[PDB]
Write an enzyme that holds these catalytic residues in place. Structure first.
Site, PDB file in Angstrom:
ATOM      1  N   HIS B  26       0.801  -1.228   0.000  1.00  8.39           N
ATOM      2  CA  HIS B  26       0.000   0.000   0.000  1.00  8.39           C
ATOM      3  C   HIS B  26       0.831   1.275   0.000  1.00  8.39           C
ATOM      4  CE1 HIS B  26      -4.143   1.699   1.484  1.00  8.39           C
ATOM      5  NE2 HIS B  26      -3.610   2.440   0.528  1.00  8.39           N
ATOM      6  N   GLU B  69      -4.412  -4.177  -1.842  1.00  9.54           N
ATOM      7  CA  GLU B  69      -3.847  -2.843  -2.015  1.00  9.54           C
ATOM      8  C   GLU B  69      -2.379  -2.856  -2.437  1.00  9.54           C
ATOM      9  OE1 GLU B  69      -5.123  -1.379   1.922  1.00  9.54           O
ATOM     10  OE2 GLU B  69      -6.520  -0.085   0.822  1.00  9.54           O
ATOM     11  N   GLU B 145     -14.676  -5.093   0.590  1.00  9.97           N
ATOM     12  CA  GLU B 145     -14.819  -4.263   1.793  1.00  9.97           C
ATOM     13  C   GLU B 145     -15.925  -3.230   1.599  1.00  9.97           C
ATOM     14  OE1 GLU B 145      -9.952  -4.313   2.144  1.00  9.97           O
ATOM     15  OE2 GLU B 145     -10.999  -2.643   3.110  1.00  9.97           O
ATOM     16  N   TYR B 146     -16.806  -3.102   2.585  1.00  7.07           N
ATOM     17  CA  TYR B 146     -17.841  -2.071   2.549  1.00  7.07           C
ATOM     18  C   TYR B 146     -18.353  -1.802   3.957  1.00  7.07           C
ATOM     19  CZ  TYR B 146     -21.938  -5.176   3.225  1.00  7.07           C
ATOM     20  OH  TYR B 146     -22.890  -6.034   3.752  1.00  7.07           O
ATOM     21  N   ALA B 147     -19.108  -0.721   4.119  1.00 18.01           N
ATOM     22  CA  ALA B 147     -19.706  -0.362   5.410  1.00 18.01           C
ATOM     23  C   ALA B 147     -18.669  -0.324   6.537  1.00 18.01           C
ATOM     24  CB  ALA B 147     -20.875  -1.286   5.744  1.00 18.01           C
ATOM     25  N   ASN B 205       2.147   7.397  13.717  1.00 21.60           N
ATOM     26  CA  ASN B 205       1.057   6.450  13.922  1.00 21.60           C
ATOM     27  C   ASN B 205      -0.252   7.009  13.388  1.00 21.60           C
ATOM     28  OD1 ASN B 205      -0.868   7.491  16.200  1.00 21.60           O
ATOM     29  ND2 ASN B 205       1.212   8.017  16.859  1.00 21.60           N
ATOM     30  N   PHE B 209      -7.578   4.652  14.013  1.00 28.75           N
ATOM     31  CA  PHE B 209      -7.942   4.069  12.719  1.00 28.75           C
ATOM     32  C   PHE B 209      -7.715   2.545  12.620  1.00 28.75           C
ATOM     33  CE2 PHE B 209      -7.985   3.699   8.001  1.00 28.75           C
ATOM     34  CZ  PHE B 209      -9.250   4.235   7.789  1.00 28.75           C
TER      35      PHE B 209
END
Ligand code: NA
Ligand code: NA
Ligand code: NA
Ligand code: NA
EC number: 3.2.1.23
Lengths: 211, 211
Positions: B26, B69, B145-147, B205, B209
């Protein structure tokens, strides 16, 4: 098929035309009773073939149509292929029998809604957005009829246009329709008034539905 | 790839598993800097090939994933084809480079919305309804991936499920995610509390998250 001058004016002023065979058997039960009958193929064929022979040189004509509201019969498939064979320059469309049959190059429903499904047996009208992505479906969708403009109407029109602009394969539609089919009658003083079904002693009739 | 017991448990309790190679790059600029570099194919190939060799007999594994990613690079295409050649029994998916590249059997976007387009350059996230019907698109769509369930979240969840149920080719998705990545620290009184990014003197950092 229209009055011949119509095409000349559309050529010259610039409008795309769907030229449509004079075939509608709406009142039959079921709707394809005649159009699936090989006995009516000759009569149907002349309404398609003679239209093509007359109008094929008009640039305004961009799509051929096999008629309206005659279900889907084997006669439609035969005449679909006839046009594809003699004139490869124009797509063929036809709505009858569920708007996405083997007799149409364009998914062309009438009054399919933007987001709401109407799952009628055999001839459902899917949300137009959903219709495009049904398994195996690849064709463009253009409504042959939408936004029925009867009286105080055209509510939700913007919803169609928002969708047309967002989805590449939603390429628009034809509003139903241009002009009220009202007729002039006269009162005892000679003053004109707009008349509709039933006003001429005509019976049975469907009243204001012609407007 | 998970601890081997997970697959045994998913086999026995009954859960469908997306088994995913340990490849995420990523932080590269652009994201495919290494995955499009043939110098990195060997390291990549072992992370895919040794996963398939280990887990291929588990019924719970229904889909292989090329990682996460890492943009879209040539190494993905080679490894996609490697899996298709050795294991035809499972579809291969991968989200990188716009969720619908040549390296994925399933359109598998992350956080694409139901109705709203997000037209980022190169890697747009189309409305999931719209994505299915883009010219020439035929694949099923399942969100990897969602919500994003971060904190007080999952607003608009019902909207995804309304769409999943209406559209045959929208076949669901994977919520992000299951469990908060918080860690237990202890205060001066020896009482436990939940910690996130930055609470270990770790810098730079990204704070909460991880939850
Ligand atoms: Na469009
Ligand atoms: Na009418
Ligand atoms: Na579905
Ligand atoms: Na996170």
């Amino acid at each position: 098929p229209n009055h011949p001058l119509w095409y000349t004016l559309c050529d010259r002023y610039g409008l795309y035309v769907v030229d449509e065979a004079n075939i509608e058997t709406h009142g039959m039960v079921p709707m394809n009773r005649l159009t699936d009958d090989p006995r009516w193929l000759p009569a149907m064929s002349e309404r398609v073939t003679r239209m093509v022979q007359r109008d094929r040189n008009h640039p305004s004509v961009i799509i051929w149509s096999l008629g309206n509201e005659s279900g889907h019969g084997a006669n439609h498939d035969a005449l679909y292929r006839w046009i594809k064979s003699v004139d490869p320059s124009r797509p063929v469309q036809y709505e009858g029998g569920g708007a996405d049959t083997t007799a149409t190059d364009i998914i062309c429903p009438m009054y399919a809604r933007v987001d709401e499904d109407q799952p009628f047996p055999a001839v459902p009208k899917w949300s137009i957005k959903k219709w495009l992505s049904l398994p195996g479906e690849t064709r463009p969708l253009i409504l042959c009829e939408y936004a029925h403009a009867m009286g105080n109407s055209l509510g939700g029109f913007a919803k169609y246009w928002q969708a047309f602009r967002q989805y590449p394969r939603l390429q628009g539609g034809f509003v139903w329709d241009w002009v009220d089919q009202s007729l002039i009658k006269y009162d005892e003083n000679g003053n004109p008034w707009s008349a509709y079904g039933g006003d001429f002693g005509d019976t049975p009739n469907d009243r204001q539905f012609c407007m």
